[PDB]
Design a protein around this ligand. Structure first.
Ligand SMILES: Nc1nc2c(c(=O)[nH]1)N[C@@H](CNc1ccc(C(=O)N[C@@H](CCC(=O)O)C(=O)O)cc1)CN2
Ligand SMILES: [Cl-]
Ligand SMILES: [Cl-]
Ligand SMILES: [Cl-]
Ligand SMILES: [Mg+2]
Ligand SMILES: [Mg+2]
Ligand SMILES: [Mg+2]
Ligand SMILES: [Mg+2]
Length: 159
Protein backbone atom coordinates (compact mmCIF):
# COMPACT_ATOMS: atom_id res chain seq x y z
CA UNK A 1 0.00 0.00 0.00
CA UNK A 2 1.18 3.53 -0.84
CA UNK A 3 1.08 6.46 1.58
CA UNK A 4 2.13 10.09 1.25
CA UNK A 5 3.78 11.97 4.10
CA UNK A 6 4.06 15.73 4.00
CA UNK A 7 4.37 18.91 6.03
CA UNK A 8 2.04 21.69 4.83
CA UNK A 9 2.06 25.40 5.64
CA UNK A 10 -0.98 27.60 4.96
CA UNK A 11 -2.11 27.34 1.31
CA UNK A 12 -0.64 23.85 1.12
CA UNK A 13 2.90 25.17 0.62
CA UNK A 14 5.58 22.52 1.02
CA UNK A 15 9.33 23.05 1.09
CA UNK A 16 12.57 21.08 1.11
CA UNK A 17 12.78 25.16 6.09
CA UNK A 18 10.74 28.27 7.04
CA UNK A 19 9.88 26.50 10.31
CA UNK A 20 11.96 24.57 12.82
CA UNK A 21 9.96 21.55 14.03
CA UNK A 22 12.07 18.75 15.50
CA UNK A 23 8.80 17.18 16.71
CA UNK A 24 7.60 16.93 13.11
CA UNK A 25 10.89 15.39 12.05
CA UNK A 26 10.47 12.81 14.84
CA UNK A 27 6.96 12.08 13.52
CA UNK A 28 8.38 11.73 10.00
CA UNK A 29 11.08 9.32 11.17
CA UNK A 30 8.70 7.27 13.31
CA UNK A 31 6.28 6.85 10.43
CA UNK A 32 8.91 6.09 7.74
CA UNK A 33 11.47 3.95 9.60
CA UNK A 34 11.83 0.41 8.26
CA UNK A 35 9.82 1.29 5.13
CA UNK A 36 10.97 2.19 1.64
CA UNK A 37 10.84 5.91 0.86
CA UNK A 38 10.25 7.26 -2.64
CA UNK A 39 11.37 10.81 -3.48
CA UNK A 40 12.14 12.94 -6.52
CA UNK A 41 15.65 14.06 -7.37
CA UNK A 42 15.14 17.62 -6.05
CA UNK A 43 14.16 16.22 -2.64
CA UNK A 44 17.07 13.75 -2.72
CA UNK A 45 19.59 16.52 -3.42
CA UNK A 46 18.09 18.61 -0.59
CA UNK A 47 18.46 15.76 1.90
CA UNK A 48 21.96 14.93 0.63
CA UNK A 49 22.46 11.63 2.45
CA UNK A 50 20.36 8.48 2.53
CA UNK A 51 17.75 8.39 5.28
CA UNK A 52 18.95 5.66 7.64
CA UNK A 53 16.96 2.49 8.22
CA UNK A 54 14.96 2.99 5.02
CA UNK A 55 15.42 1.92 1.40
CA UNK A 56 15.87 5.21 -0.49
CA UNK A 57 14.34 5.16 -3.98
CA UNK A 58 14.85 8.18 -6.21
CA UNK A 59 12.37 8.79 -9.02
CA UNK A 60 14.02 10.68 -11.87
CA UNK A 61 14.02 10.45 -15.65
CA UNK A 62 17.68 11.42 -15.39
CA UNK A 63 19.33 9.43 -12.60
CA UNK A 64 22.43 10.61 -10.77
CA UNK A 65 25.32 8.21 -10.16
CA UNK A 66 25.21 7.95 -6.35
CA UNK A 67 25.38 4.24 -5.53
CA UNK A 68 23.96 4.70 -2.03
CA UNK A 69 20.38 4.96 -3.31
CA UNK A 70 18.17 3.13 -5.83
CA UNK A 71 17.39 5.07 -9.03
CA UNK A 72 14.16 4.47 -10.97
CA UNK A 73 12.58 6.16 -13.99
CA UNK A 74 8.81 5.77 -13.49
CA UNK A 75 6.14 5.43 -10.83
CA UNK A 76 5.62 1.80 -11.80
CA UNK A 77 9.35 1.05 -11.53
CA UNK A 78 9.52 2.83 -8.17
CA UNK A 79 6.75 0.60 -6.85
CA UNK A 80 8.34 -2.58 -8.28
CA UNK A 81 11.66 -1.70 -6.65
CA UNK A 82 9.91 -1.74 -3.25
CA UNK A 83 8.59 -5.23 -3.79
CA UNK A 84 6.44 -7.03 -1.24
CA UNK A 85 6.27 -4.66 1.72
CA UNK A 86 3.28 -3.60 3.81
CA UNK A 87 3.66 0.12 3.22
CA UNK A 88 5.54 2.39 0.80
CA UNK A 89 6.13 6.00 1.89
CA UNK A 90 6.21 8.78 -0.68
CA UNK A 91 8.06 11.79 0.67
CA UNK A 92 7.81 14.33 -2.15
CA UNK A 93 8.37 16.76 -3.68
CA UNK A 94 5.47 18.48 -5.42
CA UNK A 95 5.40 16.62 -8.71
CA UNK A 96 6.10 13.24 -7.14
CA UNK A 97 3.25 13.73 -4.66
CA UNK A 98 0.98 14.69 -7.58
CA UNK A 99 1.89 11.53 -9.52
CA UNK A 100 1.49 9.18 -6.52
CA UNK A 101 -1.69 10.58 -4.95
CA UNK A 102 -4.03 8.50 -7.19
CA UNK A 103 -2.24 5.35 -6.06
CA UNK A 104 -2.21 6.29 -2.37
CA UNK A 105 -4.60 4.97 0.27
CA UNK A 106 -3.26 6.90 3.27
CA UNK A 107 -1.98 10.42 4.03
CA UNK A 108 0.20 11.50 6.93
CA UNK A 109 -0.01 15.29 7.08
CA UNK A 110 1.41 17.92 9.38
CA UNK A 111 -0.63 21.11 9.16
CA UNK A 112 1.74 23.88 10.23
CA UNK A 113 0.45 27.24 11.46
CA UNK A 114 2.81 29.27 9.31
CA UNK A 115 2.31 31.54 6.31
CA UNK A 116 5.40 31.26 4.09
CA UNK A 117 6.71 32.52 0.72
CA UNK A 118 7.15 29.27 -1.29
CA UNK A 119 5.68 28.30 -4.67
CA UNK A 120 5.59 24.49 -4.42
CA UNK A 121 2.30 23.01 -3.23
CA UNK A 122 1.00 19.68 -2.03
CA UNK A 123 -1.55 18.23 -4.50
CA UNK A 124 -5.25 18.97 -4.47
CA UNK A 125 -7.20 16.13 -2.93
CA UNK A 126 -10.95 15.86 -2.47
CA UNK A 127 -11.53 15.96 1.28
CA UNK A 128 -14.80 14.04 0.75
CA UNK A 129 -12.77 11.04 -0.50
CA UNK A 130 -10.84 10.71 2.80
CA UNK A 131 -11.59 10.01 6.45
CA UNK A 132 -9.63 11.62 9.29
CA UNK A 133 -8.62 8.78 11.60
CA UNK A 134 -6.16 10.69 13.79
CA UNK A 135 -5.50 14.32 14.59
CA UNK A 136 -3.35 15.92 17.28
CA UNK A 137 -2.59 19.59 17.81
CA UNK A 138 0.61 20.79 19.45
CA UNK A 139 1.60 24.27 20.57
CA UNK A 140 4.94 25.81 19.72
CA UNK A 141 7.57 25.52 22.47
CA UNK A 142 11.25 26.26 23.11
CA UNK A 143 12.28 23.64 20.52
CA UNK A 144 9.47 24.05 17.93
CA UNK A 145 9.00 27.40 16.18
CA UNK A 146 5.33 27.13 15.22
CA UNK A 147 2.19 25.26 16.26
CA UNK A 148 1.20 22.25 14.16
CA UNK A 149 -1.43 19.54 13.83
CA UNK A 150 -0.64 15.96 12.87
CA UNK A 151 -3.32 14.16 10.85
CA UNK A 152 -3.72 10.73 9.30
CA UNK A 153 -6.34 10.22 6.59
CA UNK A 154 -7.49 6.99 5.01
CA UNK A 155 -8.99 6.84 1.55
CA UNK A 156 -12.71 6.06 1.32
CA UNK A 157 -13.42 7.05 -2.30
CA UNK A 158 -11.57 7.34 -5.61
CA UNK A 159 -12.24 9.50 -8.66
N1 LIG B 1 6.11 15.38 8.19
C1 LIG B 1 7.03 15.76 7.27
N2 LIG B 1 7.00 15.24 6.08
C2 LIG B 1 7.91 15.59 5.18
C3 LIG B 1 8.88 16.53 5.49
C4 LIG B 1 8.89 17.09 6.77
O1 LIG B 1 9.71 17.93 7.09
N3 LIG B 1 7.95 16.68 7.64
N4 LIG B 1 9.86 16.92 4.56
C5 LIG B 1 9.92 16.33 3.21
C6 LIG B 1 11.23 15.58 2.98
N5 LIG B 1 12.36 16.31 3.57
C7 LIG B 1 13.12 15.79 4.63
C8 LIG B 1 14.30 16.42 5.01
C9 LIG B 1 15.06 15.93 6.05
C10 LIG B 1 14.63 14.78 6.74
C11 LIG B 1 15.42 14.20 7.85
O2 LIG B 1 16.56 14.56 8.04
N6 LIG B 1 14.85 13.26 8.63
C12 LIG B 1 15.55 12.59 9.73
C13 LIG B 1 15.09 13.07 11.10
C14 LIG B 1 15.73 14.42 11.42
C15 LIG B 1 16.89 14.21 12.35
O3 LIG B 1 16.69 13.66 13.55
O4 LIG B 1 18.00 14.53 11.99
C16 LIG B 1 15.16 11.14 9.59
O5 LIG B 1 16.00 10.14 9.92
O6 LIG B 1 14.07 10.89 9.18
C17 LIG B 1 13.46 14.15 6.35
C18 LIG B 1 12.71 14.65 5.31
C19 LIG B 1 8.80 15.32 2.89
N7 LIG B 1 7.86 14.99 3.95
CL1 LIG C 1 5.71 11.19 16.88
CL1 LIG D 1 11.48 16.18 -5.83
CL1 LIG E 1 9.07 25.02 26.19
MG1 LIG F 1 25.78 2.67 -9.94
MG1 LIG G 1 0.56 19.60 -7.94
MG1 LIG H 1 -4.09 17.39 -9.10
MG1 LIG I 1 -18.38 8.95 1.58
Amino acid sequence: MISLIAALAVDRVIGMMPWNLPADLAWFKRNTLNKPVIMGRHTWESIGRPLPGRKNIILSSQPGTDDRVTWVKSVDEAIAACGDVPEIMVIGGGRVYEQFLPKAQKLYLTHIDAEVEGDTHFPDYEPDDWESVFSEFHDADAQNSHSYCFEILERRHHH
